Amino acid sequence: NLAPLPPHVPEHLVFDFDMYNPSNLSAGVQEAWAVLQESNVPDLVWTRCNGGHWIATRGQLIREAYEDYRHFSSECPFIPREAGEAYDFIPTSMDPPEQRQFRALANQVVGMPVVDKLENRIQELACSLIESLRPQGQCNFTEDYAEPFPIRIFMLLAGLPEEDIPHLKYLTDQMTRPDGSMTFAEAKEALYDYLIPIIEQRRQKPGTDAISIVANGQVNGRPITSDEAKRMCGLLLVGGLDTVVNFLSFSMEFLAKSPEHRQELIERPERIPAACEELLRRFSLVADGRILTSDYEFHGVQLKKGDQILLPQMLSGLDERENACPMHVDFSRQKVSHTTFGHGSHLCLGQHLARREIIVTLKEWLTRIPDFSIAPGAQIQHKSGIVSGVQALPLVWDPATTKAV
Numbered sequence: 001n002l003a004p005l006p007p008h009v010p011e012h013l014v015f016d017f018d019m020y021n022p023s024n025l026s027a028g029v030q031e032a033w034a035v036l037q038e039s040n041v042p043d044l045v046w047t048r049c050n051g052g053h054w055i056a057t058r059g060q061l062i063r064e065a066y067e068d069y070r071h072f073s074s075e076c077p078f079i080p081r082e083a084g085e086a087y088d089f090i091p092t093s094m095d096p097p098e099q100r101q102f103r104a105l106a107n108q109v110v111g112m113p114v115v116d117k118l119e120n121r122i123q124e125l126a127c128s129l130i131e132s133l134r135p136q137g138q139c140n141f142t143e144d145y146a147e148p149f150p151i152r153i154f155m156l157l158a159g160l161p162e163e164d165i166p167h168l169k170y171l172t173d174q175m176t177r178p179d180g181s182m183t184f185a186e187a188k189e190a191l192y193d194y195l196i197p198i199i200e201q202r203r204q205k206p207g208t209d210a211i212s213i214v215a216n217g218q219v220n221g222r223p224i225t226s227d228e229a230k231r232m233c234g235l236l237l238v239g240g241l242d243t244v245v246n247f248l249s250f251s252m253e254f255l256a257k258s259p260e261h262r263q264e265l266i267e268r269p270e271r272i273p274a275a276c277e278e279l280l281r282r283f284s285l286v287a288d289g290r291i292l293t294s295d296y297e298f299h300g301v302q303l304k305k306g307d308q309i310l311l312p313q314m315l316s317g318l319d320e321r322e323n324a325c326p327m328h329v330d331f332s333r334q335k336v337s338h339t340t341f342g343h344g345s346h347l348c349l350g351q352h353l354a355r356r357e358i359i360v361t362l363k364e365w366l367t368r369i370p371d372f373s374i375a376p377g378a379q380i381q382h383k384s385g386i387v388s389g390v391q392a393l394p395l396v397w398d399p400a401t402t403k404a405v
């Protein structure tokens with residue numbers, strides 16, 4: 001299902017990429033997207049899939065478009081257009097200077113000082129989850145750790161019932177890796193039905209949870225509205241439920257396959273932080289975009305006002321012009337260059353939270369379960385979308401090689 005090419009698009013710029021179902025999926029999701037950086041592919045292409053849109057393929061263009069909010073607006077950041085259209089999260093569907101005030105609040109809730117406060121719980125939950133898995137010699141990493149770990153910390157931050165996990169996660173999943181079961185707007189509405197009552201309750205009777213702070217915050221000297229709060233919280237939810245969750249499984253899947261990488265971390269733990277950035281570069285997973293606010297000529301291509309452009313965060317660090325041997329994991333690269341957490345005004349506020357969760361997991365898993373591998377005859381499947389994922393990650397190990405702490 002290719003849409004007829006608009007008049008302004010030179011046929012030589014066509015490259016029919018399906019962000020939802022790339023061709024090489026079997027080879028891995030990052031590998032499937034990297035096809036866009038092959039020699040035969042222009043720097044800026046048009047795809048007729050998902051209704052027709054541009055895709056910038058190089059770290060340089062992505063960062064440029066990201067910096068340029070005058071031309072490239074966050075107003076309609078999702079493809080297909082109907083999704084970008086229905087998209088109304090804050091601060092994400094706003095451009096500076098408006099974005100700034102909401103960002104400042106969102107920072108209050110997820111920023112550094114919060115992580116610093118949550119640290120012991122993060123470490124507590126990791127250790128507990130791992131210890132519980134250890135003696136089994138086998139899990140479903142995706143369902144066994146990658147989901148509970150980051151989710152439960154979020155649920156704690158947000159003050160929401162663990163019981164709501166399944167329902168929330170389903171809906172979150174519909175936004176980033178649509179099934180066909182529901183449209184973005186339906187998914188969005190349903191999360192909204194969830195939130196409303198909660199916000200109301202927390203405007204009346206404030207807690208110390210993230211939702212309470214958001215619901216009662218100040219923006220531009222006045223009180224946030226209910227609708228604004230509902231709209232920030234919607235973003236926070238997706239961030240908590242759908243980001244770190246997917247990242248951990250790619251990393252884990254790599255670790256399962258590379259004994260030498262595991263060992264390196266065990267003997268030279270001072271390398272963990274460096275390793276985490278490298279894994280963030282290699283297993284980068286997000287791809288959203290922007291809308292053209294006007295006609296504009298960008299690197300010699302004419303973009304028409306209203307044109308959508310996918311600026312895959314994923315691709316910057318995979319770009320050879322940016323990283324030598326991009327597909328190779330090397331914990332000792334002189335310069336790890338990525339835009340995994342975005343670029344420009346929308347740089348991810350939850351990055352601090354995500355790094356703390358990644359580092360704790362590596363340190364804590366390796367400690368207890370130094371030696372593991374993918375289950376025999378398990379075929380690992382990746383999934384593409386706004387946020388890519390791993391479908392299931394069967395791991396096996398000998399309990400006898402584990403260490404209890």
Ligand code: HEM
Nearest residue numbers: 091092103239240243244247340341342346348349350354
């Ligand atoms: C692997 C982990 C994550 C990755 C790769 C990631 C990636 C991103 C990206 C690329 C953006 C910018 C989107 C744009 O420019 O349209 C973003 C924004 C944002 N992320 Fe993260 N995210 C992650 C985890 C988190 C977590 C755990 C939270 C907190 C619950 C969070 C909260 C935010 C917020 C609030 C924004 C909006 C900032 C603004 O619009 O000013 N993210 N994230």
Ligand SMILES: CC(C)(C(=O)c1cccnc1)c1cccnc1
Nearest residue numbers: 175235238239286288348386387
């Ligand atoms: C692409 C993006 C920004 C994403 O991956 C994300 C979501 C919340 C926090 N951090 C990143 C996203 C995903 C789903 C809904 N809105 C935004």
